[PDB]
Structures are given as structure tokens and as C-alpha cells.
Design a protein around this ligand. Structure first.
Ligand SMILES: N[C@](CC1c2ccccc2Oc2ccccc21)(C(=O)O)[C@H]1C[C@@H]1C(=O)O
Ligand SMILES: N[C@](CC1c2ccccc2Oc2ccccc21)(C(=O)O)[C@H]1C[C@@H]1C(=O)O
Ligand SMILES: *[C@@H]1O[C@H](CO)[C@@H](O)[C@H](O)[C@H]1NC(C)=O
Ligand SMILES: *[C@@H]1O[C@H](CO)[C@@H](O)[C@H](O)[C@H]1NC(C)=O
Ligand SMILES: [Mg+2]
Ligand SMILES: [Mg+2]
Lengths: 445, 442
């Protein structure tokens, strides 16, 4: 009985977005979700509607075959995503040709385990886990976002650029830190790099554990000034805090993964200790054409997004008479107010274009000379569509070239930043790692 | 379509058994399974039929409610088990009231993630993962086999019985080793035991890693003679082989989890360095009544088991397309016969289901003969509650019950590797750990 955002067309593309937060602890068994989300939820629902409209109006891509949608809420939760994925396949047990999403790797894995049983290709836009490259387990999965293994690669390229042969290695416990570090250490051993102090830090580690980590790192100075951190941001923060307690500054060169990236909250109150840090993050340029569409949406005319009323009330802290807020909505409020575009918007859009390019390629091969769908695509053969998707390529929404390797994995493009004192402290852009190629301003770093 | 072993009844019990081995590597995408299995497969299918027959004949348990079955093949594989679990619920898209199995914890987790969405209770007979006690994730899961956390408890009770105050600790990387050792350490930190050297290793790690392990261990001597190993067998083997390469013997007292248990392949070739080792394993008392039924099965009579002809041909190497001889239907099941070591648990899991149903009936249909409107259909969330509160005497005389997390009591054998009063190295039975009570003989 959960809401579904729909658009009819010749071929239906499924999607799972986090329209709401996960069930609160108490709401878990009933699968009742948390509050509505804009950036991970409403913005993505809307980007999908608008992208399908653009593809449909495009005479060059799928000229005679229209795309529709069936967009479901994952609530950033494995149980709900699975419940909703069953809804995709329920009638078969218009079928969906493939699925965009869900957002997180643990949830994407749950969904893939179901989808693959029905030969439904799945294209992720933000799931970066290294496990998902395993095609013996996840045959039907592919993605337009780089695997975290390319972080390990980039960080090692940075180390090698400056001719270091020893480094220390710290990671956070859990899939993200451990598999990222495992990838780094595997490459390091192949390429002549030696590990000094190695440590795995728990999510709940106290000040004493951090104190000790700092002691172990300082023991290897000065031979191992470089500390490679495949770390969640609060692991980095715990190290900075230990530095403060000991009263030491600037002994190390910290190289951090995107758990740290350019997050102010990691270094707030500890800028002096963090200064000099090198970090990476996914490149994600804003998509202007999304803003042009989204910022113009109106409560009264947006009928196709069934969650838009719930959103409008939350967004403008108001109520629609006929539940928590005093103000009565006018419908004339401005979405520009405090507006921030989903940082992953470009990947969401490219994943949808990817689905469209796979279908076009399928049509060229299976229905040559036939206007629109032919019998060979009635219904669409998911196993064949997977093959076509993997071999598809195109220029994505920000000018980058989108394509997939044999494992369904994407190329990687990261920004390299260096925390610096300015005249405030800023994460200064010092270069990029672009599809295997590191480029850094050595002078600025 | 994959075969299904069925039996009609008023209430249908699902089951997933490893009737076949998992798909060979090249078969994985088509979900075509490996070869037929006896102990993990065919025996379990049969025990389920016969147990249901026995319950249905019983005048006291479920008087005028017949239990049926829909037994499916998991092929010891997440993907196949999930495909088959989807088949169970296809009805809702006679419904299944609950599910027995599958065998492995990682496969059981995958099945539970699907079953819980349809409020179908699931009872495991061999999935021992500590993870499965998390009722926020696995609300509809319960089991008649002890969580591996009770191995850690039993191991600590052994350590304390001998007044040891310091131990070293080794575990295999991954869920089994890490979760077992986390439990042990958590208990040790509550009860005055100190950990000297602590280490983790993969089974596939090289000799250089085991060299470093043993080197690191020997440094914490002479005060840390005892090594607690929550280890898969090949981790123990990696340590025994590092011991030979250094030429050391009898310097440690090894206390091993059921990864080691009484396995010959762990110690073969290293009997002398493994000697004196202490291990535990789940008790598995043989079920006489299963032997009496199973050993009398005939190819021509057994029509309800669709896998029986495939099993017969493989068991007696004949045809009815790989072997030359034609099966008579007369060959004896008693040759090289071994009963599934988990047979007691399989049966108890089935009885647990029946008792849950009975208790639901007593409460919801009080005084009624057979199913009343309140149990048409069976409300899975209610049945879960009734299962959790059920208790009964199991097939071997043990008391079966569940705590609030669906977890079972634990009974382990304790064994000691010894040089016998002959000239052979044997795993000798030295005691038991019975539901919190440690009993050892000198
Ligand atoms: N890329 C994410 C997150 C990525 C990650 C990958 C694998 C396992 C854990 C894990 O958690 C962290 C933690 C810190 C930094 C990056 C990750 C994904 O879940 O795939 C991202 C969609 C999730 C989101 O936006 O929250
Ligand atoms: N109890 C098992 C095995 C148990 C285990 C539990 C959790 C994770 C891994 C894991 O692997 C090991 C390794 C060594 C010793 C015991 C275990 C289960 O999978 O639950 C059961 C399937 C095994 C069977 O029936 O053969
Ligand atoms: C590292 O060594 C290389 C090769 O000798 C040299 O070209 C370069 O100057 C060094 N790199 C940096 C960043 O100093
Ligand atoms: C919204 O704006 C329109 C156009 O300016 C105006 O006529 C109308 O009164 C406004 N509605 C509300 C509820 O303020
Ligand atoms: Mg078009
Ligand atoms: Mg009866």
C-alpha cells in the first residue's frame, strides 16, 4: 500500500530512492519509515521524471520507443527495499525492464540478490562497495559510480608520486574501511611499498584507544610521516583529538579517503591539527538543467509525484488543511530557499541515460529496420539487455564518458584536496585522479 | 521446474534441505546444482516425512489437525534457497505456516530476510551464527541448535576449571572466528581472565604468516601456555605445521572450538604436535527410530520422495546415465551407512513447529476439535509468539525451549587428543558442557 510514482510508456524503468528516512528503532517491524528526504529522495524522484521526459522528447535517442517509470521508496532500509522489489516482480509472479538504485551498498546487495533471480539488470548511482564487482554473486549489477577500490588506487598513486616507500595504514572497522584498505595493501605489496604501523579502529573507540593509536604512529617517525587513512570521518576526528590531548601538531602527512573528503565537521575545532591533510572525494559537478526544472515546481500542479504534498509541508514547515506545523502553506513558497542540489545528481541522471542507451542498442540488434518494439523485444529479455548495457557507452550529463567494464564497473574521477590555512582553513583543490591518471599541483601542495 | 517433496494436510510446513551440493562454478548463473547428498539431503527429507507421519498418528499432539509438507532443495546456496523461498510465498502473490531450515547461517540469513516480510516463522537445526540472535534484523528466526556464543562460554568454563589466569587467543578472520572470539573476550573481560597475545589469521594465509603467528605466541611464554582458538580447522592446521617447521613440540595447551572438533584432516601428519589438545563439538546422539525407518526404504515403494531414484542410482552406482549396471531395487542401504550427525536437531525443529501450532490452538481455539475460524488462516505473527514460548521433551530426552531471541540451550561434548593404550592418536571423550554445567573426568 506504499505510494508509487508512475509514468506510462512503452518500456518501464523501475527505481528505488530513499524518499523517506529509515524506520525509527520502534517502527522497524512494521516497516513504517522516518521523515521525508529531499536530496536523497524527492530530488531524485523528480530528476527521474524530468530525465525520462528529456529522453522521450529527444529525436536521436530511442526515437520511436517511449520510456515510463515505476519509482518506489527504499526508505534507506534493506527490509523496505526488498518489500518494494517484490512489488516490482509481483504481477509477473507492464513488467519493469531494469532498476535504478538503491543508494547504499548493503541495501543494493539485498535488492540484487532478488532482482537477479528474475534477470532484471540493476544500475546503481552511489553504491561503491568493492563486493559488488563480484559477478559470481552479483551478475545483474552494474553502476555509473566508481568502486572504492579506485580510491585505494588513487591514494597509492599519491604515495608513489612523492617516492615514499614506507607509510602507516589506518582504517575504520566495517566493509568500507576494511575492503578499501585490503585493496590498498594488496597493491602496495605488488609495487614495492612497505607498511609501518597498521591499525583497525572500531566505530565506538574511546579516547584511550585513539591515544594509543597516536603513540603507535609516532613510534615510526620520521621514517613514516605518511599515514594512509581509509577511514570514516569520525575515525579521523578521533585521531585529531588525540593529537590535541598530546599537544602535538604537524608531524604527519595524513592521506584520507572520501570518508573524510572535504567535511568541515571532521576538523571543526581541530583545524590546527588537521592542517596539511590530503583528502579525496568523488567529482560531482552540479547539473544546472536539474535546478532549472526543480526550482520551478509547484505544489498545485505537481500531480505525478505522490509524495510532493508530504514534502512541501516538511520543506516549508507548514500544513495543508484538510499535521505538526502552525503555518498554513500558500503554495507560493520558494524552493530556492536554502536550496542545495543532491551531490549525486549527475550519477542519478547518467544511470538513467545508461538504461536508455542499453535499450536502444538492444533494439538496433534485435529489431533492425523495425519502428519501435518488435516481437524479439516483447517482452524484453533481461539476460540480453544485461549484455547490451555492459557494452553501452555515451557522453554523460557533465561531459564525462560513461562506459562499463566486463564487471559492470565505472571509471573513477576524484578531486584531490589539501587542507590549508588561508587568511580561515579551507580544503584547497590541488588536482584530480581521472580514470587512472593522477594530476597534482606539487607547488600548491 | 525444480522438484518438490509434498504431503497434503490441514497445515503445511515448509522445509529447505541441501538435497544437492551447490552449483559448480560454471553452473552458478543457471542455478543448476551439484551432485545429490545423503546426510544433508535425502536423509533429512525422509526424516521429515516420517516425523510428520509420527505426529499425525499421535493422539495427544495435534489430535485432529494434520500436518502436511512442501520440502524444497536449497542446494546449499543462497541463490537457489532464495529462488525456492520465493516459491513458498508465490501462493500469497494452501499457504506455508512456517519453514524448517536451511542449513547454513549465511544461507539462513538470506531466507530469513525474505520470510519475515510474510510473517513466516523459521526454525533452524544447524545455523549457529551469533548474528541470527539479533531480533531487530531476524524477528522471525529461531533455532533448536545453540548459538556459537555458547561455545565461547563453554571454552571459558574449561579455562576456569583449570585455574588458568592468562591465555593467548587466536581466531580465523570472518564471521565464525571473529564473532566467536568477540564473545569469548567479552566474557573474559567480565570474569577476571587476562588475554596475553591476541591474533587473527585467514585459513588460506601462507606459511610466513603462520611463522609470524607462532613466533608472536612463543614470546608471551612462559606465562601464557594456553591458547584459545576460535578457529576453522585449517587455521589450527596452519599452526601445527608452523610448529614442525620450527621443531617445537608440547609447549602449548590448545583449546579449540568446533571448527576443530574431532576432525582428522586438521591433525593428520601432525598428531604429535596436536597431542593434548582440547576441543568441543555439538553433541549428536544417534536417533535409533530414524535408522529403523530409513534403512528399510525401497526404490519401488518410495514415490513421495521425488529425488529417491537419483539418490538410489548414485548411492549404489547404477542406472534405471553414468554407470553400466542396472539397479535391481534390492541393494541394501546399510552398507557404509552413517546417520546425519544433525538428525536429532532436524527432528526437534519439526516437533517445535508442531508444538507451536498446538499451543496456538489451545489459546485461540480453546475446546475446539481441529482448526477453528481463528486459525483460518494461521496468523504468522501470532504463531511466532507461541513458538517462542513452547517447550517440550525432544527426540533424545532433552528439554527443548527458546529464550526471547529464539535461541536454544547448548550441549557440547568435550574432547582431548591422546596417545591411546594402543599406538594410535585418538580424540577421547573427556566430558560434557550441559546447559551451563561443565563436567569433566580425569
Ligand atoms: N558509497 C556509499 C557509502 C560508502 C560505503 C560503501 C560500502 C560500505 C559502507 C560504506 O559506507 C561509507 C562510509 C564512509 C564513506 C563512504 C562509504 C555506499 O553505501 O555504497 C554511499 C551511498 C551511501 C551514502 O551516501 O550514505
Ligand atoms: N553451523 C554452521 C557452520 C558454522 C558457522 C556459523 C556461522 C558462520 C560460519 C560458520 O562456519 C563454520 C566454520 C567452522 C565451524 C562451524 C561453522 C553454520 O553455517 O551455521 C553449519 C553450516 C554448517 C554445517 O551444517 O555443516
Ligand atoms: C620522485 O622521483 C622521480 C624519479 O627519480 C623524480 O622524477 C621526481 O622528481 C620525484 N618526485 C617528486 C614529486 O619530488
Ligand atoms: C499565489 O500567487 C498568485 C500569483 O501571484 C496569487 O494570485 C495568489 O493569491 C497566491 N496564493 C496565495 C495562497 O498566496
Ligand atoms: Mg526519444
Ligand atoms: Mg496428531
Amino acid at each position: 500500500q506504499r505510494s508509487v510514482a508512475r509514468m506510462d510508456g512503452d518500456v518501464i524503468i523501475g527505481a528505488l530512492f530513499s524518499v523517506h528516512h529509515q524506520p525509527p528503532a520502534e517502527k522497524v517491524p512494521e516497516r513504517k519509515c522516518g521523515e521525508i528526504r529531499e536530496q536523497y529522495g524527492i530530488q531524485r524522484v523528480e530528476a527521474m521524471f524530468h530525465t525520462l521526459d528529456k529522453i522521450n522528447a529527444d529525436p536521436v535517442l530511442l526515437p520511436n520507443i517511449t520510456l515510463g517509470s515505476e519509482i518506489r521508496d527504499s526508505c534507506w532500509h534493506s527490509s523496505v527495499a526488498l518489500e518494494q522489489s517484490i512489488e516490482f516482480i509481483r504481477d509477473s509472479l507492464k513488467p519493469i525492464a531494469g532498476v535504478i538504485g538503491p543508494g547504499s551498498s548493503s541495501v543494493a546487495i539485498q535488492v540484487q540478490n532478488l532482482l537477479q533471480l528474475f534477470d532484471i539488470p540493476q544500475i546503481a548511482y552511489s553504491a561503491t562497495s568493492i563486493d559488488l564487482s563480484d559477478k559470481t554473486l552479483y551478475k545483474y549489477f552494474l553502476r555509473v559510480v566508481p568502486s572504492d577500490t579506485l580510491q585505494a588506487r588513487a591514494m597509492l598513486d599519491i604515495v608513489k608520486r612523492y617516492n615514499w616507500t614506507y607509510v602507516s595504514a589506518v582504517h575504520t572497522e566495517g566493509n568500507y574501511g576494511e575492503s578499501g584498505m585490503d585493496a590498498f595493501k594488496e597493491l602496495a605489496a605488488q609495487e614495492g611499498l612497505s607498511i609501518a604501523h597498521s591499525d583497525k579502529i572500531y566505530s565506538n573507540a574511546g579516547e584511550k584507544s585513539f591515544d594509543r593509536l597516536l603513540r603507535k604512529l609516532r613510534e615510526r617517525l620520521p621514517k613514516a610521516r605518511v599515514v594512509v587513512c581509509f577511514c570514516e570521518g569520525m575515525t579521523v576526528r578521533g585521531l585529531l583529538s588525540a593529537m590535541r590531548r598530546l599537544g602535538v601538531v604537524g608531524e604527519f602527512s595524513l592521506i584520507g579517503s572520501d570518508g573524510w573528503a572535504d567535511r568541515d565537521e571532521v576538523i571543526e575545532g581541530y583545524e590546527v591539527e588537521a592542517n596539511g591533510g590530503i583528502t579525496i572525494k568523488l567529482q560531482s559537478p552540479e547539473v544546472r538543467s536539474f535546478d532549472d526544472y526543480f526550482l520551478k515546481l509547484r505544489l498545485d500542479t505537481n500531480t505525478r509525484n505522490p509524495w510532493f504534498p508530504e514534502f512541501w509541508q516538511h520543506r516549508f514547515q507548514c500544513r495543508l488543511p484538510g499535521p505538526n506545523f502552525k503555518r498554513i502553506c500558500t503554495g507560493n513558497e520558494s524552493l530556492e530557499e536554502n536550496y542545495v542540489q543532491d551531490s549525486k545528481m549527475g550519477f542519478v541522471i547518467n544511470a538513467i541515460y545508461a538504461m536508455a542507451h542499453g535499450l536502444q542498442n538492444m533494439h538496433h540488434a534485435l529489431c533492425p529496420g523495425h519502428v519501435g518494439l518488435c516481437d524479439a523485444m516483447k517482452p524484453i529479455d533481461g539476460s540480453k539487455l544485461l549484455d547490451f548495457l555492459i557494452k553501452s557507452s555515451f557522453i554523460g550529463v557533465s561531459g564525462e564518458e560513461v562506459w562499463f567494464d566486463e564487471k559492470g564497473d565505472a571509471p573513477g574521477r576524484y578531486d584531490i584536496m589539501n587542507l590549508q590555512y588561508t587568511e580561515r582553513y579551507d580544503y584547497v583543490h590541488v588536482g584530480t585522479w581521472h580514470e587512472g591518471v593522477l594530476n597534482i599541483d606539487d607547488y600548491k601542495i
